[PDB]
């Protein structure tokens, strides 16, 4: 085989050049943009090859850590556009640190808890900042952040009685949920609601009545899921849809065959990463939204007794995704991003890392099989495919809240 | 009146007409986290927004203030909600507000709040007369804007404006036949008008799609649409399609065509086709070709399909 200091890469194989776009001599905006990205990516790939010498890939953990540590405390005015998503920023940063196995000082943990408490609304749920109306996005993020901290102090911050009332206040008769009072409706809400309701043990038999059916209506001719019935299949909305159904134990409401074929088709043959929609560009954040669907589908099919399922790999190219993330999505100054040429941000840092962890770790039943590309130190902590926080954090939180009654219900 | 970037703009803390109300600072706690270092102008507007919100002041000055708050952060849904409360309380001219949201969306077309606000206005007015044209302009700038397409489907379905959408679809497909959002709109229009059960309509669509495939063999959208309109009844229910694809294979053995053949074989085996052993063998051979050479990025998927086929039809 190869010496330990050289590791052959899929993206560097000579035959990999055959995977370049074939535009059939018919140019459109779509093919032109795709070709431009592939050209840049090939240049990047080649920079990691020195003829037969191919040094192991390195995740710049320390650089990422310092960037995250600073962001958790202060942000430049460049983030004014996210002033209504602060609990969300907290989650992105904390989950990134969690994946990197970077401890959270007790003081920082308490400060986060106090801040999220200030974001909690008297009517239930959390807003994008102190005094803001509650919204399912920051609510989902706040709950996840508190669970990552995992202390009784963090858990108890959540006003469970009002949270359940708040979810009821957003529930529509057709099974869908508004993102906030007087707000828009799409599959993101069903996932946010299912996520926080299941973690905090506040699910009632009627809360999600009709929700599974509404989500199934969102799956389209492509096999993927759109934001609302009729819309184009999209990785973000598909993750939300399937994850919510898994929580509701209603995955069978979907055509899992067309969904599986659709998501696997979203991995780019040349880049190795995933696109959000068919015929659109690769993007590091879809490393999670799309790739995260494979562990969910694996579980779904496994529950059905599928005898053909792998006992060692997810149904996507785990190595290629790792190659795309490690070679193309790291900012030398720390942080991760969409693709070469784009600037870093905490959102991409969170999801590029989340996707990398999914690609490195396979687990099913009593079987565990890791594939950590590059130096061993690249190994990230595992992440739960449904909630996207540590599996340990999920178990600890669910066990804690299961000891509490469902607010005003039996 | 005056915009945030206008030379004569004055901070709210310096406006005489606002002197009677005390600004309300944001309480982030003594030891802040994810603390944004706001500009003086940003904080000024929001300190006063918090004041009017806290006092629930349904006034014209409050209404004008939300405009600046929105320019500073159009993603602040709390401001948008309050602005709508004011629109009703003050009985503001909704057509004037439509012109406002039109300009706002043009500036920030990928924002959730602006499109929802527009939908609310259209619902309040029950006036969709400007929608299709406005949306077309947004799509002329970004033909794949998700929010634009979503709003377009809502308007068409809610106000029954189906008459010219297929023509619009054909127009955009001519511009970029690889635009997946347009192929989706195509399915949206047909399934909601004639439906696909009309065999004349289905044949028209299959013919059209095959022609697009011949023009651009590696455009995945057309292949996905072809499978999309035939999958529910079953790919094996269309015997002539298999023959036609097999004839094009030798000259167009793209991974899309090869994968489509496997999809057909899968369905055939699922419907007690004749020559089961032969079909299974052909399907397994293609799965290997896809996994090892033609579609290696999906090696695990194709290996899975190979094993699935054997678990279901070996005998």
């Amino acid at each position: 085989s190869s010496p330990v200091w050289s590791e052959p890469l899929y993206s560097l194989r000579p035959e990999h050049a055959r995977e370049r776009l074939q535009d059939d001599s018919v140019e459109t905006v779509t093919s032109i943009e795709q070709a431009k990205v592939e050209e840049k990516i090939q240049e990047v790939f080649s920079s990691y090859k020195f003829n037969h010498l191919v040094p192991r890939l390195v995740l710049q953990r320390e650089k990422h850590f310092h960037y995250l540590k600073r962001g958790l405390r202060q942000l430049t005015d460049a983030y004014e556009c996210l002033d209504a998503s602060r609990p969300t920023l907290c989650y992105w940063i904390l989950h990134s640190l969690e994946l990197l196995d970077e401890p959270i000082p007790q003081i920082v943990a308490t400060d986060v808890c106090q801040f999220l408490e200030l974001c909690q609304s008297p009517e239930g749920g959390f807003g994008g900042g102190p005094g803001q109306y509650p919204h399912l996005a920051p609510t989902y993020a706040a709950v996840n952040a508190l669970c990552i901290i995992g202390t009784e102090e963090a858990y108890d911050i959540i006003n469970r009685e009002k949270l359940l009332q708040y979810l009821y206040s957003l529930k529509q008769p057709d099974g869908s949920f508004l993102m906030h009072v007087g707000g828009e409706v799409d599959v993101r809400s069903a996932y946010c609601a299912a996520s926080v309701a299941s973690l905090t043990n506040i699910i009632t038999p009627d809360l999600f009545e009709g929700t599974a059916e509404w989500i199934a209506r969102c799956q389209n001719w492509e096999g993927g899921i759109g934001g609302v019935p009729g819309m184009e299949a999209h990785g973000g909305y598909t993750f939300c849809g399937l994850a919510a159904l898994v929580i509701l134990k209603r995955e069978r409401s979907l055509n899992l065959k067309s969904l599986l074929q659709w998501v696997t088709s979203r991995q780019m043959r040349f880049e190795g990463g995933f696109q959000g929609r068919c015929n659109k560009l690769v993007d590091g954040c879809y490393s999670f939204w799309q790739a995260g669907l494979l562990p969910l589908l694996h579980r779904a099919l496994h529950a059905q007794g599928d005898p053909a399922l792998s006992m060692s790999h997810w149904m996507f190219h785990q190595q290629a995704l790792q190659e795309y993330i490690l070679m193309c999505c790291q900012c030398p100054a720390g942080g991760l991003l969409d693709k070469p040429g784009k600037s870093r941000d905490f959102y991409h840092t969170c999801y590029c890392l989340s996707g990398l962890s999914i690609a490195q770790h396979f687990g099913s039943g009593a079987m565990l099989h890791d594939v950590v590309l590059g130096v061993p130190e690249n190994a990230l902590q595992p992440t739960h495919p449904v909630y996207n926080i540590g599996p340990d954090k999920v178990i600890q939180a669910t066990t804690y809240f299961l000891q509490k009654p469902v607010p005003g219900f039996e | 009146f005056v915009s945030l970037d206008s030379p004569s703009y004055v901070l709210y803390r310096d406006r005489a007409e606002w002197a009677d109300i005390d600004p309300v600072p944001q309480n982030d706690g003594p030891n802040p986290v994810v603390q944004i270092i706001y500009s003086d102008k940003f904080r000024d507007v929001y300190d006063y927004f918090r004041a009017v919100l806290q006092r629930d002041e349904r006034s014209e000055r409050a209404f004008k203030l939300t405009r600046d708050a929105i320019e500073l952060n159009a993603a602040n849904y709390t401001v948008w909600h309050f602005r709508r409360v004011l629109l009703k309380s003050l009985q503001k001219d909704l057509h004037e507000e439509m012109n406002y949201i039109t300009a706002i969306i043009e500036e920030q077309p990928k924002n959730y709040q602006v499109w929802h606000h527009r939908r609310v206005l259209v619902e309040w007015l029950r006036d969709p007369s400007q929608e299709l044209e406005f949306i077309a302009d947004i799509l002329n700038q970004d033909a794949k804007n998700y929010h634009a397409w979503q709003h377009r489907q809502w308007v068409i379905q809610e106000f029954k404006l189906w008459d010219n959408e297929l023509q619009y679809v054909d127009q955009l497909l001519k511009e970029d036949v690889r635009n997946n959002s347009v192929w989706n709109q195509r399915y949206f229009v047909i399934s909601n008008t004639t439906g696909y059960n009309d065999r004349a309509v289905l044949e028209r669509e299959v013919q059209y799609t095959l022609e697009m495939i011949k023009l651009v063999p590696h455009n995945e959208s057309a292949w996905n649409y072809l499978k999309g309109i035939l999958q529910d009844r079953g790919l094996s229910k269309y015997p002539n399609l298999l023959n036609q694809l097999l004839d094009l294979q030798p000259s167009h053995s793209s991974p899309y065509l090869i994968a489509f053949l496997v999809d057909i074989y899968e369905d055939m085996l699922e419907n007690q086709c004749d020559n089961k052993e032969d079909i299974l063998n052909k399907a397994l051979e293609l799965c290997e070709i896809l996994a090892k050479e033609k579609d290696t990025i999906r090696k695990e998927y194709w290996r899975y399909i190979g094993r699935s086929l054997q678990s279901k039809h070996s005998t």
Binding site: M179 | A75, Y112
Partner: peptide, 4 residues
């Protein structure tokens, strides 16, 4: 990439 706006989520909300």
């Amino acid at each position: 990439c706006v989520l909300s």
